[PDB]
């Protein structure tokens, strides 16, 4: 019933941070562009990289902050703001310790479950929650006080190649995606086994 009017990838930025596992988000959108052969357009209006397309009439936008993970709100508000985006007309793909690697899942509002870049979107809409999510799994380190460095390191060859599936199978449920119709986005997603 709603279409999807912005995608939002989240990372960090800088080389030190590229290909990480904080950067997944990132890297989905990243992915995302390619595939549709759109230009990642670099925005100081925005504080970050900015892309568009259309899909039906309407104007898709998608994003890469440039800010930092936790000042990553203040370029999705500034974009919505202009535009004028109701929150529930947004995308934002990011990184989930609590699922492993091969495992991706769609949410619709809900906590930021400690994510600092979830965090700060929340705060700068004005406690705006409702927007969508897209889960990719990176796996836990095992313990709460290992969190910090296990997200800002590169993992393993075999769990990238998990992690590239995940993505892949994304981008499979993308039309579902870009039309709003998120339960049989789920229902198509939420069976594949990596
Ligand atoms: O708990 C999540 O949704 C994802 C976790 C990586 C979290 C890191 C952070 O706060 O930057």
Same mark, same amino acid.
């Given at each position: 019933m709603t279409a999807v009017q912005l995608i939002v990838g989240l990372g960090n930025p800088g080389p030190e941070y590229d290909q990480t596992r904080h950067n997944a988000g990132a890297?989905? $959108?990243?992915?995302?562009? +390619?595939?549709?052969?759109?230009?990642?357009?670099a925005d100081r209006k925005y504080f970050?990289? $900015?892309?568009?397309?259309? +899909?039906?009439?309407?104007?898709?936008r998608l994003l890469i902050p440039t800010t930092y993970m936790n000042r990553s709100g203040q370029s999705v508000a500034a974009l919505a703001g202009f535009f004028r985006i109701a929150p529930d007309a947004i995308l934002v793909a990011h990184?989930?310790?609590?699922?492993?690697?091969?495992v991706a899942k769609l949410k619709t509002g809900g906590g930021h479950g400690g994510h600092n870049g979830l965090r700060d979107i929340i705060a700068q809409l004005g406690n705006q929650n409702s927007f969508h999510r897209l889960?990719?799994?990176?796996?836990?380190p095992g313990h709460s006080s290992l969190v910090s460095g296990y997200v800002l390191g590169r993992?393993?060859?075999?769990?990238?190649?998990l992690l590239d599936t995940s993505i892949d199978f994304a981008l499979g449920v993308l039309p579902e995606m870009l039309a709003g119709d998120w339960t049989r986005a789920m229902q198509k997603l939420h069976s594949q086994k990596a």
């Amino acid at each position: 019933m709603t279409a999807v009017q912005l995608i939002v990838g989240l990372g960090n930025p800088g080389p030190e941070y590229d290909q990480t596992r904080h950067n997944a988000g990132a890297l989905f $959108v990243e992915r995302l562009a +390619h595939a549709q052969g759109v230009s990642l357009v670099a925005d100081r209006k925005y504080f970050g990289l $900015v892309g568009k397309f259309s +899909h039906q009439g309407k104007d898709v936008r998608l994003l890469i902050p440039t800010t930092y993970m936790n000042r990553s709100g203040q370029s999705v508000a500034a974009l919505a703001g202009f535009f004028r985006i109701a929150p529930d007309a947004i995308l934002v793909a990011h990184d989930e310790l609590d699922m492993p690697p091969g495992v991706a899942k769609l949410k619709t509002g809900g906590g930021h479950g400690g994510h600092n870049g979830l965090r700060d979107i929340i705060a700068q809409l004005g406690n705006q929650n409702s927007f969508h999510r897209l889960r990719l799994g990176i796996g836990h380190p095992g313990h709460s006080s290992l969190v910090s460095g296990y997200v800002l390191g590169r993992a393993p060859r075999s769990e990238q190649e998990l992690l590239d599936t995940s993505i892949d199978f994304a981008l499979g449920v993308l039309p579902e995606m870009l039309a709003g119709d998120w339960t049989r986005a789920m229902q198509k997603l939420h069976s594949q086994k990596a």
